[PDB]
C-alpha cells in the first residue's frame, strides 16, 4: 500500500521569502538509494529529479534554476522536502511530488503567494 | 533508462463512443506483475490506480464511475491502455499515465471530444 503523505496540501507564502514543501514516504530501515526516485514538479515544469541516488537537473525548467533544492539528508527519514528560495508570484500553483521506493505514489500541493503591489508580474 | 512512450499524444473522439488511450512501458521477457504500478489521471482527478496486479478504484473520481477500465491483457506487451466508454464532453482534456516498473515516467495525452448540438447544448446548460 506504499503511500506518499503530505502534512500540508496548501501553503500560503509571502513574496520574497523561502519556502519548504514536504512529502513523506515510509522509511523503516537505513535507506536503499538507487531504488529511490524523487520527482518534484510545478504545473508541467520539472523542478527536481532525483534518481540513481543523485540529483538530476538537466531536465529542470528555466524558472527554478538556482532556487530549488531537495534536502537530501531528510531522505533517510522518508522526507522528500523541496526548498524554494526567493519565492515569486510565478511560483504560485499546483506542485506534485512523485516518489518511487518499492511502491509508487504522488501527492499534489497547492502553493499560494501573497505579494505587495506586484505590478511587475502584470506584464 | 525507463521511458513511457505514447504513440498518440492527441485523440479526437466522438461523444458517446468508446475511447482507448495507450501508454507503452519497456517489458523485456516475462512481466513482473508485483513491480507494476499504473495511475491513469485526467486533470487532477484519478481515473485508474493499478497496484498489486489489480485495479484499485477506491480513489476513482465520480465522473469515471463505471466507464473506466485498464486492459489487463495488454500489460504483458508493455501496453497500459485506459479504455473509457460512453465518452462525455467533460472527458475532453489532458490525461496523464504515470507508470512505475523499475524506473518511472509519465506522458500526457490530449483528448478532444466532438459532439452534436443537442449533447453540447445540455453540457452547456448546467
Ligand atoms: C511517475 C512517477 C515518477 C516520474 O519521474 C520521472 C522520471 C524521469 C523523467 N523524465 C522525464 C522527462 N521525459 C519525466 N517527466 C516528463 C513529463 C513529460 C510528459 C510528456 C512530454 C514531456 C515531458 N520524468 C519523470 C517518479 C516517481 C513516481 C512516479 C509514479 C509512478 C506511478 C504511480 C505513482 C507515481
UniProtKB/Swiss-Prot annotation, chain A:
Modification comment: Ubiquitinated; STUB1 likely mediates polyubiquitination of PD-L1/CD274 triggering its degradation. Ubiquitinated by MARCHF8; leading to degradation. Deubiquitinated by USP22; leading to stabilization.
Disulfide bridge positions per record: 23-97
Ranges for domain Ig-like V-type: 2-110
Residues glycosylated per entry: 18
Top-level taxon in the UniProt lineage: Eukaryota
Description of what induces expression: Up-regulated on T- and B-cells, dendritic cells, keratinocytes and monocytes after LPS and IFNG activation. Up-regulated in B-cells activated by surface Ig cross-linking.
Subcellular location: Cell membrane; Early endosome membrane; Recycling endosome membrane; Nucleus
Tissue specificity as recorded in UniProt: Highly expressed in the heart, skeletal muscle, placenta and lung. Weakly expressed in the thymus, spleen, kidney and liver. Expressed on activated T- and B-cells, dendritic cells, keratinocytes and monocytes.
Disorder: Truncation of the 3'-untranslated (3'-UTR) region of CD274 transcripts leads to elevated expression of CD274 in multiple cancers including T-cell leukemia, diffuse large B-cell lymphoma and stomach adenocarcinoma. Disruption of 3'-UTR region is caused by structural variants that stabilize CD274 transcripts, leading to overexpression. Increased expression in tumors promotes immune evasion and tumor cell growth by allowing malignant cells to escape destruction by the immune system.
Subunit structure: Interacts with PDCD1. Interacts (via transmembrane domain) with CMTM4 and CMTM6. Interacts with (phosphorylated) STAT3; promoting nuclear translocation. Interacts with CD80.
Biological role stated in the UniProt entry: Plays a critical role in induction and maintenance of immune tolerance to self. As a ligand for the inhibitory receptor PDCD1/PD-1, modulates the activation threshold of T-cells and limits T-cell effector response. Through a yet unknown activating receptor, may costimulate T-cell subsets that predominantly produce interleukin-10 (IL10). Can also act as a transcription coactivator: in response to hypoxia, translocates into the nucleus via its interaction with phosphorylated STAT3 and promotes transcription of GSDMC, leading to pyroptosis. The PDCD1-mediated inhibitory pathway is exploited by tumors to attenuate anti-tumor immunity and escape destruction by the immune system, thereby facilitating tumor survival. The interaction with PDCD1/PD-1 inhibits cytotoxic T lymphocytes (CTLs) effector function. The blockage of the PDCD1-mediated pathway results in the reversal of the exhausted T-cell phenotype and the normalization of the anti-tumor response, providing a rationale for cancer immunotherapy.
Homology family: Belongs to the immunoglobulin superfamily. BTN/MOG family.
Protein name stated in the entry: Programmed cell death 1 ligand 1
First-to-last residue of the parent protein present: 18 to 134 of 290
Swiss-Prot record, chain B:
Protein location: Cell membrane; Early endosome membrane; Recycling endosome membrane; Nucleus
Superkingdom, taxonomy of origin: Eukaryota
Glycosylation sites: 18
Bridged cysteine pairs (disulfide): 23-97
Positions of the Ig-like V-type domain: 2-110
Induction section of the entry: Up-regulated on T- and B-cells, dendritic cells, keratinocytes and monocytes after LPS and IFNG activation. Up-regulated in B-cells activated by surface Ig cross-linking.
Expression sites (tissue/organ): Highly expressed in the heart, skeletal muscle, placenta and lung. Weakly expressed in the thymus, spleen, kidney and liver. Expressed on activated T- and B-cells, dendritic cells, keratinocytes and monocytes.
Post-translational modification: Ubiquitinated; STUB1 likely mediates polyubiquitination of PD-L1/CD274 triggering its degradation. Ubiquitinated by MARCHF8; leading to degradation. Deubiquitinated by USP22; leading to stabilization.
Quaternary structure annotation from Swiss-Prot or TrEMBL: Interacts with PDCD1. Interacts (via transmembrane domain) with CMTM4 and CMTM6. Interacts with (phosphorylated) STAT3; promoting nuclear translocation. Interacts with CD80.
Disease tied to this protein: Truncation of the 3'-untranslated (3'-UTR) region of CD274 transcripts leads to elevated expression of CD274 in multiple cancers including T-cell leukemia, diffuse large B-cell lymphoma and stomach adenocarcinoma. Disruption of 3'-UTR region is caused by structural variants that stabilize CD274 transcripts, leading to overexpression. Increased expression in tumors promotes immune evasion and tumor cell growth by allowing malignant cells to escape destruction by the immune system.
Protein purpose: Plays a critical role in induction and maintenance of immune tolerance to self. As a ligand for the inhibitory receptor PDCD1/PD-1, modulates the activation threshold of T-cells and limits T-cell effector response. Through a yet unknown activating receptor, may costimulate T-cell subsets that predominantly produce interleukin-10 (IL10). Can also act as a transcription coactivator: in response to hypoxia, translocates into the nucleus via its interaction with phosphorylated STAT3 and promotes transcription of GSDMC, leading to pyroptosis.
Family designation: Belongs to the immunoglobulin superfamily. BTN/MOG family.
Protein name: Programmed cell death 1 ligand 1
Gene (name only): CD274
Parent sequence residues shown: 18 to 134 of 290
Amino acid at each position: 500500500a506504499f503511500t506518499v503523505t503530505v502534512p500540508k496540501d496548501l501553503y500560503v507564502v509571502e513574496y520574497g521569502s523561502n519556502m519548504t514543501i514536504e512529502c513523506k514516504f515510509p522509511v523503516e530501515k537505513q535507506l536503499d538509494l538507487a531504488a529511490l526516485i524523487v520527482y518534484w514538479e510545478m504545473e508541467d515544469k520539472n523542478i527536481i529529479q532525483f534518481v540513481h541516488g543523485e540529483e538530476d537537473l538537466k531536465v529542470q525548467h528555466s524558472s527554478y534554476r538556482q532556487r530549488a533544492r531537495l534536502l537530501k539528508d531528510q531522505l533517510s527519514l522518508g522526507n522528500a522536502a523541496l526548498q524554494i528560495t526567493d519565492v515569486k508570484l510565478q511560483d504560485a500553483g499546483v506542485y506534485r511530488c512523485m516518489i518511487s521506493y518499492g511502491g509508487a505514489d504522488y501527492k499534489r500541493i497547492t502553493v499560494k503567494v501573497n505579494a505587495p503591489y506586484a505590478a511587475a508580474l502584470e506584464h
